[PDB]
Amino acid sequence: GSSGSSGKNYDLSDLPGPPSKPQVTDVTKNSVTLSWQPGTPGTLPASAYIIEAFSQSVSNSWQTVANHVKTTLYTVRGLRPNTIYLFMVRAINPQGLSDPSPMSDPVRTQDSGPSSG
């Protein structure tokens, strides 16, 4: 469409093109807000997004930390203060998940003080 070239040409895929790397906006002791710009369709439309997180000091796994996200800006919650986190965004469609976004790179939560200062 409004482009017609890329480095590669086609794929063996029926999935959306992935989101951009998220940003980070609001953070607290245990919520943080992520903002990204969306993927684009091809074969099919998009259904929703996921966000995963990973933290060595939480569980050794990547886990789902929001599911069927219908927005581009999302407050994560329930985290641990003074703990590092990673995030990736994933698109969803009628056939699979897309390729992931880039990682957010490791945020740190604040602390469970009030931050009067």
From Swiss-Prot:
The Fibronectin type-III domain, residue ranges: 18-111
Region annotation (Disordered) ranges: 97-111
Subunit organization: Interacts with SLIT2.
Coiled-coil intervals, chain numbering: none
Family of the protein in this entry: Belongs to the immunoglobulin superfamily. ROBO family.
Task of the protein: Receptor for SLIT2, and probably SLIT1, which are thought to act as molecular guidance cue in cellular migration, including axonal navigation at the ventral midline of the neural tube and projection of axons to different regions during neuronal development.
Subcellular location as annotated: Membrane
Known disease link: Vesicoureteral reflux 2: A disease belonging to the group of congenital anomalies of the kidney and urinary tract. It is characterized by the reflux of urine from the bladder into the ureters and sometimes into the kidneys, and is a risk factor for urinary tract infections. Primary disease results from a developmental defect of the ureterovesical junction. In combination with intrarenal reflux, the resulting inflammatory reaction may result in renal injury or scarring, also called reflux nephropathy. A chromosomal aberration involving ROBO2 is a cause of multiple congenital abnormalities, including severe bilateral VUR with ureterovesical junction defects. Translocation t(Y;3)(p11;p12) with PCDH11Y. This translocation disrupts ROBO2 and produces dominant-negative ROBO2 proteins that abrogate SLIT-ROBO signaling in vitro.
Species whose genome carries this gene: Homo sapiens
Protein name in the entry: Roundabout homolog 2
